[PDB]
Amino acid sequence: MHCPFCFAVDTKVIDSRLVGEGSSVRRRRQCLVCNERFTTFEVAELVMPRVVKSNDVREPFNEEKLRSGMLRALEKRPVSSDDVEMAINHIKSQLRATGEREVPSKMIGNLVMEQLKKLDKVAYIRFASVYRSFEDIKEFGEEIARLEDH
Amino acid sequence: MHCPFCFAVDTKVIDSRLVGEGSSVRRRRQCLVCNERFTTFEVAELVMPRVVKSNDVREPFNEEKLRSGMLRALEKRPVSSDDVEMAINHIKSQLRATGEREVPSKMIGNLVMEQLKKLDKVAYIRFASVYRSFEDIKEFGEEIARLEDH
Amino acid sequence: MHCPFCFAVDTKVIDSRLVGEGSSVRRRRQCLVCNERFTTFEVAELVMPRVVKSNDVREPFNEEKLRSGMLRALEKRPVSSDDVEMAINHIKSQLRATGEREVPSKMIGNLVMEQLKKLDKVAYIRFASVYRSFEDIKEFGEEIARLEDH
Amino acid sequence: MHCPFCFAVDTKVIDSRLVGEGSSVRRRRQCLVCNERFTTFEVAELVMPRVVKSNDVREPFNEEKLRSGMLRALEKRPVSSDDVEMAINHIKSQLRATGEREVPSKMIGNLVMEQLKKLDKVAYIRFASVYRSFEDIKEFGEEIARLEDH
Ligand SMILES: Nc1ncnc2c1ncn2[C@@H]1O[C@H](COP(=O)(O)OP(=O)(O)NP(=O)(O)O)[C@@H](O)[C@H]1O
Ligand SMILES: Nc1ncnc2c1ncn2[C@@H]1O[C@H](COP(=O)(O)OP(=O)(O)NP(=O)(O)O)[C@@H](O)[C@H]1O
Ligand SMILES: Nc1ncnc2c1ncn2[C@@H]1O[C@H](COP(=O)(O)OP(=O)(O)NP(=O)(O)O)[C@@H](O)[C@H]1O
Ligand SMILES: Nc1ncnc2c1ncn2[C@@H]1O[C@H](COP(=O)(O)OP(=O)(O)NP(=O)(O)O)[C@@H](O)[C@H]1O
Ligand SMILES: Nc1ncnc2c1ncn2[C@H]1C[C@H](O)[C@@H](COP(=O)(O)OP(=O)(O)OP(=O)(O)O)O1
Ligand SMILES: Nc1ncnc2c1ncn2[C@H]1C[C@H](O)[C@@H](COP(=O)(O)OP(=O)(O)OP(=O)(O)O)O1
Ligand SMILES: Nc1ncnc2c1ncn2[C@H]1C[C@H](O)[C@@H](COP(=O)(O)OP(=O)(O)OP(=O)(O)O)O1
Ligand SMILES: Nc1ncnc2c1ncn2[C@H]1C[C@H](O)[C@@H](COP(=O)(O)OP(=O)(O)OP(=O)(O)O)O1
Ligand SMILES: [Mg+2]
Ligand SMILES: [Mg+2]
Ligand SMILES: [Mg+2]
Ligand SMILES: [Mg+2]
Ligand SMILES: [Zn+2]
Ligand SMILES: [Zn+2]
Ligand SMILES: [Zn+2]
Ligand SMILES: [Zn+2]
C-alpha cells in the first residue's frame, strides 16, 4: 500500500488484529520514507456481483428473480425445494468464484440451464424456450435434439 | 368524476368512443378548474361462474389466475396486451354463455388453448407443457405434431 | 356499450353514482333488446408515458429523477419548493398531453430547461452544462449568448 | 480473517494486488474448510481535522460530503473514479500536512477547486457556480476568465 501522506510506494505492516467479530482485519502501517503511522481496514465484499443485463443496464443481483424463473420452469415437476435451494447456492458460489464485480445475465442463465439439465429435462426445455427466446415451434425440436446428443 | 390532478369535484366529458370490440367505453374528460385532460375506461363487472378445480374444490373465478398463466406462456412473444385482453374477454364471455353456476378448470384451460392457438404457437406449446403436465421431453414434439394437425 | 349477455350494440345508462371518493363512476346499464341489467365502472388511466433514454433503453417515468436533476441546478437559488412543484406538475402535464405511450428523455430535458429559464437563469446554465454535456469552458458563454436572445 | 460463509477461523490469502493507483490492497481469500473464495479491500482510515462551517459550527470531516460535491461537478466528464479518489487522497494529505485540529470549509472548497482545475475545467466551473454562489449569469464568464488566468 502507498503512504497516504507522502505517496511513497512501500509501506510496512507494523501490527495486525481481527475486528468486527473476525470479519475484518485492522492493521497499523508505517511509511518507510516519511515514518508516519496510520490505520487500515481490510473488509470483504460479501454482496453478490451486479448483473449486466441484455441492454447493458447494471442492476444489483436479485435472488428472487433467479429463483422465480426456475420455479416457472419447474412447474408440476418432481424436484424438491431443497434441490432448488442447493442449485441456487451452487449458482451463487460460481458467480462469486469468478471474482468479478459484475457478471452478465447470460452467465446466470447458462448456470441455471446446467442445474435444470441435472434436475429436470422438461423444466430445462421450458426455461430454454424463454431464455433462448424461441420464435418458431421448430426450435423446441432443435433444443431437444441438442439435449439428446449429450 | 373528480379531477385526479386538482381534485375539483366535477369533470366534463369532451369525447366518447367504443373500444375493446364494443365491450368498453373510452372517454376523454376535462377539468373545468385546472383545464387538464385525461382518459377513462368504462368496463362491465359481471357475475362469473365458480371454478371446479381438479381436486373438486370450488373457488371463485379469478381473472388474475387466468391472465398470469397466459402471460407466462406469452413471455417475449409479439402479442399486444390488447390481444391478450380481447382473448380474456372472449374466454369470460364463453364461460358466462354456459349459464352454469360453476364450470370445470379443464373448460378454462381448453378455452385458453384455443386463444393461444390463434395468438402465438410458441405460447401454446409453453402453456400445453404445464396444462398437460409433460413428463418426458418427447412430449414437446408430440404436442407440436398435434398442434400442426388442427 | 354492447350488451355482455345478448351482444346487442345498444345499452342505455339507467343509473349513475360516484364511488372511490369521487375518483370512479359506477353505472347501471340496461340492454334494450334482452332487458338485462349490469354494472360498469369508469376509471381514469393515470399512467405517465415510459421514457426512451439516450441509448434507446425504455424505463418507467421516475418523478424523483426529474426533481433530483432540477434541485442540483437550483442549489442556493431563491426558488421555493412550491415553484419547483408547479414546474414539475407543468412538465408532467405536457408529457401527458402528448398522448404517447413513451417519450424520449430529450423531451423531458427540453421541458425542464424551459421551466428553469423562467425560474432562475443560473440554474438553467447549470442544468444545460450537464444536459448538453459541455466539453469546453467556452460552452458556458456560448449557452449564455443563446439565452441572451430568447 | 474468519470465513464469512462457514465461520472457519483462518482464511488463506491466495492473491494480492494494488488497486486505486496504489492507495488500496485488493486481496483474494480462500477458506481452507469450505473452499469458498471472496474478495477483500484494504483501505486507510485517517484522523482528519474538524471542519469549521460558514456559520462557525464545527463538524467532523465527512469524506462523503467532499466526494458527492465533486461527483456533481464531474457529471459526464472523462475523469475515472481512480482520479477522483487520488484527488481526495491528495486533499486529505494536504489537510493533514497543515497540522491543524480544525480547518475552515473555505480551505476544503479551495483545495477541491485546485484538484478540479487539474482534472476537468468544466467540472471546476460547475463546482465554482455553487461554491461561490453565483447570483447572475455574468459570473460564469467572470469565473472562466479568472480560471484561464491560471
Ligand atoms: N438482477 C438479477 N439478479 C439475479 N438473477 C437475474 C437478474 N436479472 C436476471 N437474472 C437471471 O439471469 C438469467 C438470464 O436472464 P435473461 O432474462 O435472459 O436476461 P436479462 O438481462 O434479464 N434480459 P431480458 O429479459 O431479455 O431483458 C435468468 O436466470 C434470470 O432470472
Ligand atoms: N379460480 C380460477 N379462476 C379462473 N381461472 C382459473 C382459476 N383456477 C385456475 N384457472 C385457470 O384454469 C386453467 C386450467 O388450470 P389448471 O391448472 O389445469 O386447473 P386446476 O384445477 O388449477 N388444476 P391443478 O393446478 O393441477 O391443481 C388455467 O388457465 C388456469 O389459470
Ligand atoms: N426515468 C425517468 N423519468 C423521468 N425523468 C427522467 C428519467 N430519466 C431521465 N429523466 C430526466 O430527463 C431529462 C433528460 O435527462 P438526460 O440525462 O439528458 O437523459 P438520459 O436518457 O438519462 N441520458 P444519459 O444520462 O446521458 O444516459 C432530465 O431532466 C432527467 O432527470
Ligand atoms: N464536514 C465536512 N467534511 C468534509 N468536507 C466538507 C464538510 N462540509 C463541507 N465540506 C466540503 O467543503 C467544501 C466547501 O463547502 P461549502 O458548502 O462552501 O461550506 P459550508 O460550511 O458547508 N457552507 P454552506 O453550505 O453555505 O452552509 C465543499 O467541498 C464541501 O463538500
Ligand atoms: N413461462 C416461463 N416458463 C419457463 N421459464 C420461464 C418462464 N418465464 C421465465 N422463465 C425463465 C427463463 C427466463 O430466461 C428467466 C428470466 O425471465 P425474465 O422474465 O426475463 O425475468 P428476469 O428474472 O430476467 O428479470 P427481468 O424482468 O429484469 O428481465 O426465467
Ligand atoms: N411456466 C409456465 N409456462 C407457461 N405457461 C404456464 C407456466 N406455468 C403456468 N402456466 C399456465 C399453464 C397452466 O395450466 C396454467 C395455470 O397454472 P397453475 O400454476 O396451475 O395456476 P392456476 O391459475 O390454475 O392456479 P392454482 O395455483 O390454483 O392451480 O398457467
Ligand atoms: N451537477 C449538476 N448540476 C446541475 N444540473 C445537474 C447536475 N447533474 C445533473 N443535473 C441535471 C442535468 C442533467 O441532464 C439531468 C439528469 O442527470 P443524470 O445524472 O443524467 O440523471 P437522470 O435523471 O437522467 O438519470 P440517469 O442516471 O438514469 O441518467 O440533471
Ligand atoms: N449542482 C452542483 N453542481 C456542481 N457542484 C455542486 C453542485 N451542488 C453542490 N456542488 C458542490 C459545490 C458546493 O460548494 C459543494 C458542497 O455543497 P453543499 O450542498 O454545501 O454541501 P456540503 O458538502 O458543504 O454539506 P452541507 O450540506 O453540510 O453544506 O458541492
Ligand atoms: Mg430477463
Ligand atoms: Mg391450477
Ligand atoms: Mg440521464
Ligand atoms: Mg456546504
Ligand atoms: Zn510517507
Ligand atoms: Zn383539475
Ligand atoms: Zn342484451
Ligand atoms: Zn468457509
Residue numbers in the entry:
A (entry chain A), B (entry chain B), C (entry chain C), D (entry chain D): 1 to 150
Give the published text.
NrdR is a bacterial transcriptional repressor consisting of a zinc (Zn)‐ribbon domain followed by an ATP‐cone domain. NrdR binds specifically to two “NrdR boxes” upstream of ribonucleotide reductase operons, of which Escherichia coli has three: nrdHIEF, nrdDG and nrdAB, in the last of which we identified a new box. Tetrameric forms of EcoNrdR involve alternating interactions between pairs of Zn‐ribbon domains and ATP‐cones. Our results, in combination with a previous structural and biochemical study, point to highly flexible EcoNrdR structures that, when loaded with the correct nucleotides, adapt to an optimal promoter‐binding conformation.
